Design a protein around this ligand. Structure first.
Ligand SMILES: [Cl-]
Ligand SMILES: [Cl-]
Lengths: 78, 86
């Protein structure tokens, strides 16, 4: 099937309320299939989906959370 | 000694989550700046990823045993190892 991609973004989201806003944003992005929080500090979003533009995703997060940094983009090997 | 300042056999696992809907990635990667661990995660073997490494955005290839290849900025390195069960 179609190429899927894993994207890991560091996001400024110090508490649960801020995490929920970031997760809701990410979940609404066209081609996102899943969103999970990862990291020791719970400040990474792990997103998996189809045809997502990672830079646009980061732009949208940055203008909602105040800081967002792309850490990893990896096609899903399948 | 020690002979190696970076020894992945002595590193704790990354903080990660294997998504249920995609294949489990075979490798752990670990990123160091002047031998101090900065981050860690997962990636596929026999594959590739794009990764932030200090100030740089780097294309990193993996071989069948999680050896990683990329052009890292000075003081930085990303190293791989195969996860147990693979
Ligand atoms: Cl970025
Ligand atoms: Cl997985």
């Amino acid at each position: 099937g179609p190429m899927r991609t894993k994207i890991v973004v560091k996001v400024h989201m110090p508490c649960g309320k801020s995490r929920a806003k970031a997760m809701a944003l990410a979940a609404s992005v066209n081609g996102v299939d899943s969103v999970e929080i990862t990291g020791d500090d719970k400040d990474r979003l792990q997103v998996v989906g189809r045809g997502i533009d990672p830079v646009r995703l980061v732009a949208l997060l940055r203008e909602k959370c105040g800081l967002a940094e792309l850490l990893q983009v990896e096609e899903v090997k399948e | 000694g020690p002979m190696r300042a970076i020894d992945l056999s002595r590193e704790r696992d990354p903080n990660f989550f294997d998504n249920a809907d995609i294949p489990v990635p075979e490798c752990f990667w670990f990123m160091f700046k002047n031998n101090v661990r900065q981050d860690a995660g997962t990636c596929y073997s026999s594959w590739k990823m794009d990764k932030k490494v200090g100030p740089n955005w780097v294309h990193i290839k993996s071989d069948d045993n999680c050896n990683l290849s990329g052009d890292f900025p000075p003081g930085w390195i990303v190293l791989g190892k195969k996860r147990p069960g693979f």
